[PDB]
Every structure is written in structure tokens, then in C-alpha cells.
Amino acid sequence: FSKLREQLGPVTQEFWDNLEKETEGLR
Amino acid sequence: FSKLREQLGPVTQEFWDNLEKETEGLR
Amino acid sequence: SLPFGWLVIGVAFLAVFQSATKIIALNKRWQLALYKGFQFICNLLLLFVTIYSHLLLVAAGMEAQFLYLYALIYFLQCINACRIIMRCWLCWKCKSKNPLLYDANYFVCWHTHNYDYCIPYNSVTDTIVVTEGDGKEDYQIGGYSEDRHSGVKDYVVVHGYFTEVYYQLESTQITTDTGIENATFFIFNKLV
Amino acid sequence: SLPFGWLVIGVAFLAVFQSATKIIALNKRWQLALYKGFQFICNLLLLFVTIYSHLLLVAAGMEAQFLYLYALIYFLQCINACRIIMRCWLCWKCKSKNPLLYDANYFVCWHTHNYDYCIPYNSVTDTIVVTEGDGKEDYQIGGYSEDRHSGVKDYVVVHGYFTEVYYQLESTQITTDTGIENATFFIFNKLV
């Protein structure tokens, strides 16, 4: 069960950072 | 504007206490 | 003649916005506004899908059955709108946009010459602890952090929907007293 | 043949439950469960109003237009369900029902012989302050209070969705050091 947690750990943060990069100049 | 705040202050808490009395034996 | 397709469209969009708000992580400040902003849009959608549906019931004549239910919906919407107005009154009173962003019950606040600190808080307690430190200099309470721009006033106050609770600064725990380097602890006691 | 009335009924009930959840005060513990429970019902309603509407679009043949939108809705619902499963995993891991009740990002936890403390927290900080006191004996962090039943362990940990951050107890600020009667301050530092 911990393997899924390890795999899913940083992908959400990476997606949030991608959103940061995309919409930084919009707000 | 503060008169409405003073009037509305304790009525919400009294309603919440009424809910406490009503549904205490339900949960 | 009100077409039924608009109801389905509003339902789909409202589902989209519930789904968006139910997964947004509340880590950074920008998300909170987004987390609020989506909700705002959702609220409009929640209105749009409601009255239109009501406009269908009167159109079909099936409104006499559930007039009480829609009246309850409108009453609760009025309560929510009044809550939002109280939040706006608080953020005007606290001189910061934090009350509209955070969803905490209370807000511990103190005003300085240039900046005003409005940190969310759960409930009124006997004591309040503020941790000043850096990695960036900031004041942290219960995990919620605010970038400090000045000192701390010896009179700190907690805002609420109907409460205004003043606190008295009693002791300042410097690193020598605590043994934790680069961390200053300010302790406030609730004034009677 | 799927009648259109069920969609309106689901819309009305979903509006009722949004309106209920958007006004519930998060002061006492029982409300939180209610605040969660209503949401749970709402989620079911959010599902019921969605697929049924989808079942209408295939019925009317207008499904090829917005298949992407409903796919996004279902994807976000799957993400929300996975989030709820992670919350259940956390509350099983933290030995308490607090993670399902509170909506905080992290949970500072420590396990004792008889009771287990799982107090919500915003984010991982360098230090964590716990205030022990009564009026009832309890431990308070950031306003969130939990009725104490035992002492405090010198190793306290912060749970998260993907983080497990241990903390070290450095200093205990007793009333003599602080000058605040009937209030004990425990300070924990983040272990490297």
C-alpha cells in the first residue's frame, strides 16, 4: 500500500508547481 | 451597523444549544 | 417557455465546480483565493440551477408541492449571504484580506504602523503563542504563517463573528530561555 | 425512458445540502461530523444529479457534445474519492477519527498507552507549541483543543498526505518561567 503513496507523493506537488508557472503572469 | 451585530450575537448560540438539546439523544 | 437543456448545462457546470473545490489543496495563499473564487462561482451556479429549476416548477404547475423546500433553500442562501457580508465586515475591520481567504472561526489580529497581522485561529483560548523565525522572517500561529514586516504589539486581539477578545503580552521566550536557536516565542494571556 | 422530474428533485435536494454545509459553524466536535456528514450526503447527491443528467444526454443523443466535460467530472470525482481513501488511511494510521472530521492539511500526533492525540495543524514548521491547561484539562495547538488523558511524549510526530515529520521535545515552559498561572508550554523542534 505504501508503494502507491511513494509514487504519488511528488507528482501532485510537481503539478502544482506547473500551475504556478502557467498562471503566475495571469493573476 | 453594530446594533444588528449586538442583536444577532447570542441568538445563533441559543439556536445551537437548542439543537444540542434536541439531538443529544439521537447520536 | 423555459427549455430544459439549460438546467442540465447548469447541473454539469455545478458538478465541475464542486469537483474542483473538493480537491484544491490549501497550502499556499494563491490557492486559498482560488479555493474561495471557485466556491463563489459555484454559489452563482448553485443559484442559477435553483431558481431556473423553480422557474420550471411554476412552468409545469408542480410548484405547489415543494414551495416549502425552495423557501428553505432561499432562506439558507440568505443566511449564507449574510455570513459573507459579516466576513467582508471583518476583513474591513481587520484591515486584511485573510478573513475572506481562510475559513477559521476566529482571527487573532494586531495592527502596526505599516502592516496589519490577521492570523486565523480556531477558538478563544487562555493563552496564545506566536513563533517568530525564518528559514524568511515570519510569525506563525498554529501552522498559519504570515510574513512579518515589523515588531509585535503588546496588545493583540482576536476577532470573531461576534467576539472581540483582547490579550495581554506576558512573557517573551527568547532562544536562551528555550534553547531553540532562531525562534522567538511570544505568549499572550486573555485579559479579563 | 428516464423522466426529467428526478433531475429537478435531485437539484433541489443538492441545493438544500450545499446550503446546509455552507452555514454550519465549526465550533464543537459534533458539528464537524455533521459538517462532514452532510457533505457526504451532498457528494452522493452530486453523483446522483450528475450520472442521471448524463443518462439524459445519452437518452436525447446530446451526449457527443459534452462527453469531455462529464469525463472531467468523473475524473475529479475519482480524485476526490482517492483523497477520502487517503484520509481514511490517515485516521487508521493516526488511531483517531480527527482526520475525517477536521479539514487541516497536516495532523500533529503522538500515541500514549491509553489515548492517542491527533491535533490538526496547517503546515510543517520549525517549532510546535502545545499549551496544557484547564478552565477541563486539555492540550491546545493553534486553537484546536483535545481533552488530555495522559502526559506528553518527548517524541511528537506530524502526519500528512505524504509527509511523516518527527519532532524533538526541547524545553517545557512551566508557569514559573512564563509567569502565566495554570498553563504549561511544551516546545518541539523539527528533527533533521
Author numbering:
A (entry chain C), B (entry chain D): 25 to 51
C (entry chain A), D (entry chain B): 40 to 174, 181 to 237
Tell me, in the authors' exact words, what the paper reports:
SARS-CoV-1 Orf3a does not have an obvious pore in its current conformational state, and its aqueous vestibule is also electrostatically positive. Further supporting the idea of two distinct lipid bound states, we observe pronounced electron density for the MSP1D1 scaffold protein in this dataset and built a model. MSP1D1 binds to SARS-CoV-1 Orf3a in a similar area as Saposin A. Accordingly, density was observed in Lipid Site 1 with weak density observed in Lipid Site 2, suggesting a preferred Lipid Site 1 bound state in maps of Orf3a that contain resolved MSP1D1 density. This difference between the SARS-CoV-1 and SARS-CoV-2 Orf3a MSP1D1-containing nanodisc structures likely reflects a variation in particle heterogeneity between the datasets and not a distinction between Orf3a proteins. We reason that Orf3a is not engaged with both molecules simultaneously due to steric clashes with R122 and between the two DOPE headgroups, as well as differences in lipid density presence or absence between the cryo-EM datasets. This is consistent with the published cryo-EM structure of SARS-CoV-2 Orf3a, in which the authors observed density in Lipid Site 1 and high-resolution density for the MSP1D1 scaffold protein, as we observe in our SARS-CoV-1 Orf3a map. A comparison of the surface electrostatic potential in this putative region of VPS39 binding highlights an acidic region of SARS-CoV-1 Orf3a which is neutral on the SARS-CoV-2 Orf3a surface. In contrast, SARS-CoV-1 Orf3a does not cause the same cellular phenotype and does not interact with VPS39.
The severe acute respiratory syndrome associated coronavirus 2 (SARS-CoV-2) and SARS-CoV-1 accessory protein Orf3a colocalizes with markers of the plasma membrane, endocytic pathway, and Golgi apparatus. Here, we show that neither SARS-CoV-2 nor SARS-CoV-1 Orf3a form functional ion conducting pores and that the conductances measured are common contaminants in overexpression and with high levels of protein in reconstitution studies. Cryo-EM structures of both SARS-CoV-2 and SARS-CoV-1 Orf3a display a narrow constriction and the presence of a positively charged aqueous vestibule, which would not favor cation permeation. To explain this difference, we find that a divergent, unstructured loop of SARS-CoV-2 Orf3a facilitates its binding with VPS39, a HOPS complex tethering protein involved in late endosome and autophagosome fusion with lysosomes.
